[PDB]
Design a binder for this molecule. Structure first.
Ligand SMILES: OC[C@H]1O[C@H](O)[C@@H](O)[C@@H](O)[C@@H]1O
Lengths: 106, 301, 247, 41, 106, 68, 101, 41, 41
């Protein structure tokens, strides 16, 4: 019945549900792994975004990337890294919120 | 540490701050009022008649700022002089440095807030009420203006006194250069706009009145009757046909053919040149009045 | 006509208060609404004087003293225009002539306050001599004397206008040529160029003249408001600063 | 009608204020005063 | 009677009177003192303005600061100097003209 | 024939404009051409105003380029 | 570069034109007509749209810009300017003959 | 007439499309979509 | 009326000059000539 609660949240707010522990633990593990990657460390914007995500996960919360910044940053890092991505970033690609509706340009 | 300024002395200074601009000479603008305001404080702090004279001579130096934003400077000066009277090594340079470094930016921030933001709005409201015969206008103006003034002065003086020169070292630096640069750019832009739009130099005389051809005017004589005539007239006006058989061109039209506001820009530049040549602005204002009168008499304006 | 001794004294007192607040500029007894309404209340002509005060306050919104540059003295304009309107009869319909004469009175008051601010230097020198002795009483006395003199600056023309009775005031109100009024209006409409010139001279450099030109040209588009022009100027300043810090 | 600034006009028998011109005058004076005050520090 | 002549000047021109000798001598002394101050020397704009003032004083004239530049420069120097000002600049603060009237912004 | 000749003569000036632009066009000054073209669609702007805008833009660009 | 031909002439609805038939008489009729014109009502019951109107809907001067760019390209291709001038005259004449200009 | 976007209006009995407003809507949507798509990479 | 440039128009019986368009043509030619001459040095 967690899917119905998630749907209600997505129709109402962000982060208003329990934020189940398994996803939070996975996010913490992958953020810790990624922050120990020298190639990732050389990328300041990715480090800042991963730090924000890790701080959110430490409080059992999911980052609400309403500015849609994390995934383009990961793509930029992958492009700059000769089109190669560590598994931690691949697993973290599915850890943000990315607001779920809009009205169109006209 | 035995010498302490009670709340009564600070209240007396705050009350005497009303007379800050009492003298306002042209060389050391608010020096006399600044010295008059501090007399109770320097009277309690200093007693030997050499400290009194030294403090008076110290505080008769050049001072000038917005009369309302002088309250934090007064409070900081009160704290500094209280420390100095207790034996602290604030000899002469820190006090004058605080005064000079605060009077400038505080005046530059307080003139727009009070002279050009709060006063115009409150005065416009009061004038709108008063022109409609309502006595509530002047009452609202007086009450609101005085309440804001006294509250701001008292609270800023207390904040400055309880801060004690800390606010000086807290802020101020190279930011005042970027702020000045941006303000200069915006000011030049907006002053160009205001010279274009608000300097009223309009010329009446006409330079030509030609008789335009048959096909260029509406020719009301050959027009239908009723709603058909109105429709034909409106359609011909929409096509650009003149409402009269003569085309009158004025000097203002010729000047606007080049660019609107050309005479205003020329007058502003001439006034700038006159001001650069050490011509007093009051002479220029009187001359502008005389030029307006003469040009009206000569049908030029 | 009906001004008795008490009303004359009250008018003189209101004029003195307006003159004092012309320099103090804290309680704003010199503002056109306050001064004109007080003149009306003491003279009994409350409503026309209130209307004149509202109109003149609307005219005198931007009269601000900045640094040593003095604004055109709303105090004398207000007091003299209210007194002349009261003396000339035709209360509510006489506002137009008072408004017409107010601005030249404002310039005359600006000249008078320039003179008085010049003479304040001797008072300040005497106060320096007092401060060399540590005398607080003398400094306070001379500050009070300076305030009194500045108030008397406005209190004297009011007394002179009262001395020159209602007869001549009405005879000059009726004998005012229309061309003089229109020329005065044109001149007043042209006056603002002096303040614009002073401000521009203060902030004119060859690096900011292009922004002046752009603003002047963009003001010719009547469909652009002043808030829009200000926003354009702020954005241009921000862009220029951003492109300048990286160089 | 004679213009007297800030949207104030007067006939030979009546004076009135144009509210739009008065508002524009207030806004322009505000912007110019802020710019001149901040530029002169 | 010098005050009346000064008032007439202020209503007509700038520098059209005698420019009394004591003020000129004081200005010369304070400008000479200030131009020998290393902290002032490090400030180029203040040095330029003080040089202009001293050049005017050498010819028994008062500088007409119609651009209103000297006092903001002194304020900038004081702020940059940890909010401290030498006595020479304090005494020179009252040595410029600063035009005495204007028309308002509207 | 007369009306067609008038239309053609009104269209001729494009050749001179093309020659001048070809002489003085680079990819760094094309944005100014576009800005001028768009701003000319405002009928209330005169040619002196457009020239003043262009001069001011050139001055600002030169000032921001000398410090680089 | 001005284009004459019209692309559409639709019959606009009842409430969009002034309807001079149902109009007051005298100064009242003139006032009503002026007020309706100020409200945006059409002076006729048909709305005619020209090709120039469609071109200006995108941006005024589009055809002039296109012609100038084409002339630039032709000059780059070593075509003499006198040939281009004569061709512009010929195009003007032909387009007048074809009711395009 | 009720506006419904992209130049579409409707009375109580008829609906129609303003062609100029529809073209402007298409152009503006095109520009905004291109800019937002390229800015979001 | 046939346009011939520089504000010159001709009917089937008369020719005239629009002074405003002629002045605008002169000003534009002046600006363009100055710019092209200085840009070509
Ligand atoms: O410029 C700040 C301050 O300067 C002078 O003291 C006077 O003109 C004041 O009215 C003004 O507020």
């Amino acid at each position: 019945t967690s899917l119905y609660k998630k749907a209600g949240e997505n129709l109402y707010f962000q982060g208003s549900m329990k934020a189940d522990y398994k996803k939070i633990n996975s996010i913490l593990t992958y953020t810790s792994t990624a922050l120990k990657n020298p190639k990732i460390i050389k990328d300041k914007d990715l480090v800042v975004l991963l730090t924000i995500i890790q701080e959110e996960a430490k409080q059992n919360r999911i980052f609400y990337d309403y500015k849609r910044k994390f995934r383009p940053a990961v793509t930029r890092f992958t492009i700059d890294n000769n089109f190669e991505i560590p598994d931690c970033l691949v697993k973290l690609l599915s850890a943000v919120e990315t607001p779920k509706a809009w009205s169109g340009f006209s | 540490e035995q010498l302490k300024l009670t709340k009564k002395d600070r209240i007396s200074v705050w009350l005497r701050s009303t007379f800050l601009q009492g003298s306002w000479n042209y060389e050391r603008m608010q020096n006399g009022g600044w010295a008059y305001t501090l007399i109770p404080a320097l009277k309690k702090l200093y007693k030997t008649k050499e400290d009194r004279s030294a403090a008076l001579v110290r505080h008769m130096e050049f001072f000038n700022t917005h009369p309302y934003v002088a309250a934090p400077i007064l409070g900081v000066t009160l704290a500094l002089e209280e420390e100095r009277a207790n034996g602290a090594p604030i000899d002469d340079v820190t006090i004058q440095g605080v005064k000079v470094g605060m009077m400038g930016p505080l005046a530059g921030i307080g003139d727009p807030v009070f002279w050009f933001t709060v006063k115009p709005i409150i005065g416009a409201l009061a004038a709108s009420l008063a022109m409609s015969g309502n006595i509530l206008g002047p009452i609202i103006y007086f009450v609101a203006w005085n309440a804001i003034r006294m509250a701001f002065t008292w609270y800023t003086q207390e904040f400055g006194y309880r801060a004690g020169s800390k606010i000086t070292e807290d802020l101020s630096g190279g930011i005042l250069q970027d702020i000045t640069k941006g303000a200069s750019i915006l000011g030049m832009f907006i002053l160009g706009s205001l010279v274009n739009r608000w300097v009223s130099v309009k010329f009446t005389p006409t330079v030509s009145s030609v008789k335009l051809d048959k096909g260029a005017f509406i020719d009301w004589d050959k027009l239908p009757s009723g709603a058909k005539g109105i429709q034909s007239a409106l359609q011909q006006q929409a096509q650009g046909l003149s409402l009269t058989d003569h085309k009158i061109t004025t000097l203002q039209d010729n000047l606007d053919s080049l660019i609107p506001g050309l005479a205003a820009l020329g007058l502003t530049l001439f006034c700038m040149w006159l001001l650069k040549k050490k011509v007093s602005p009051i002479v220029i204002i009187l001359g502008l009045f005389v030029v307006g009168i003469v040009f009206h008499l000569l049908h030029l304006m | 006509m009906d001004l008795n001794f008490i009303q004359v004294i009250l008018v003189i007192f209101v004029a003195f208060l307006a003159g004092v607040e012309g320099i103090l500029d804290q309680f704003h007894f010199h503002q056109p609404v306050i001064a004109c309404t007080l003149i009306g209340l003491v003279t009994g002509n409350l409503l026309p004087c209130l209307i004149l005060g509202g109109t003149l306050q609307m005219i005198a919104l931007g009269w601000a003293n900045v640094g040593a540059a003095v604004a055109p003295d709303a105090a004398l304009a207000s007091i003299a225009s209210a007194i002349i309107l009261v003396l000339g009869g035709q209360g509510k319909a006489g506002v137009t002539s008072a408004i017409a004469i107010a601005v030249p009175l404002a310039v005359a008051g600006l000249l008078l306050t320039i003179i008085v601010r010049t003479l304040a230097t001797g008072i300040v020198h005497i106060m320096d001599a007092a401060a060399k002795e540590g005398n607080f009483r003398k400094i306070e006395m001379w500050q009070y004397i300076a305030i009194i003199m500045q108030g008397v600056r406005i209190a004297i023309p009011a007394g002179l206008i009262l001395a020159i009775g209602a007869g001549p005031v009405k005879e000059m109100l009726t004998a005012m040529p229309v061309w003089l009024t229109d020329g005065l209006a044109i001149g007043g409409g042209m006056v603002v160029a002096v303040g614009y010139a002073m401000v521009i001279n203060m902030m004119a450099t060859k690096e900011v003249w292009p922004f002046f030109a752009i603003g002047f040209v963009l003001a010719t588009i009547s469909q652009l408001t002043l808030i829009g022009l200000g926003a354009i100027g702020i954005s241009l300043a921000l862009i220029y600063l951003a492109l300048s810090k990286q160089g | 009608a004679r213009s007297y600034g800030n949207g104030v006009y007067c006939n030979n028998k009546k004076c009135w204020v144009n509210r739009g011109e008065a508002t524009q005058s207030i806004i322009g004076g505000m912007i110019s005063g802020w710019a001149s005050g901040l530029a002169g520090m």
